[PDB]
Amino acid sequence: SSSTKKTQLQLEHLLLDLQMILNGINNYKNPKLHLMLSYGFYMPKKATELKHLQCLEEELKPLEEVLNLAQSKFNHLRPRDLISNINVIVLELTFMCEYADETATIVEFLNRWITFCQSIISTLTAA
Amino acid sequence: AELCDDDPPEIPHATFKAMAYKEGTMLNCECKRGFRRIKSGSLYMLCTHSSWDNQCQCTSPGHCREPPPWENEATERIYHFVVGQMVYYQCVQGYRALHRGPAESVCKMTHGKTRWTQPQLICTG
Secondary structure (H helix, E strand, O other): OHHHHHHHHHHHHHHHHHHHHHHHHOOOOOOOHHHHHOOOEOOEOOOOOHHHHHHHHHHHHHHHHHHOOOOOOOOOOOHHHHHHHHHHHHHOOOOOOOEOOOOEOHHHHHHHHHHHHHHHHHHHOOO | OOEOOOOOOOOOOEEEEEOOEEOOOEEEOOEOOOOEEOOOOOOEEEEOOOOEEOOOOEEOOOEEOOOOOOOOEOOOOOEEOEOOOEEEEEEOOOOEEOOOOOOEEEEEEEOOEEEEOOOOOOEEO
16 A cells, blocks of 8 residues: 555665665776675575565675775765665664575675665565 | 775785785785674774774784784785885795895875886795
8 A cells, every 4th residue: 555655665765875886886987896896795595575684784884894995986975874874774674684605796785685675666566 | 095906916925914004004804714704794904193993703103003813814814005005025935035126015106096016026945
């Protein structure tokens, strides 16, 4: 009903907030990109329901440690701002998270959770 | 404050350490064979009247100074260096150097581009 539509709004916002980060790092005019890709992030054992966002939440601190690597400002906006806006949206969407066996690149991580948000949005608008 | 995008060059059978870790230098949190940093753990430590901040965890003088160790860290430390950092090369055990040129490298920026001065060394045994 209405609950689902407000939910997929929150997903759209989280999703663009991620979209912009991963465009801003997956650009060639980013030198440090290799140095970022050098770090591995724990991946969800599976992500299909909103509670799994715990996993994303957990990796949030390492992730900003990656973004602080870029010292210019493709966006121009304290990385803490993006990260905390995203964190608030994540909380607005407490649980136990199991991860995948292997870590993955920052790109891989963000592709996964972006695909996840668009997955869930497409899921709900059914009925 | 400016970091080398690249790591210092490798010499066959040689290791590059540092005598002064310049404010800016960061140290990866890298665990032993079989060990994974904590979930929601720091990926690296960083230098900042100036010392380090953050700490690593694993589970199956104008500059900062050599950080103390942590439980189950991988043998091989891994850093990344800001410009003006000098990194000194030494040969492995069982080998010996020839220094046919300088045995150090420096994070330098030229017209906006980070580079490491090519050291000149090789080791026989």
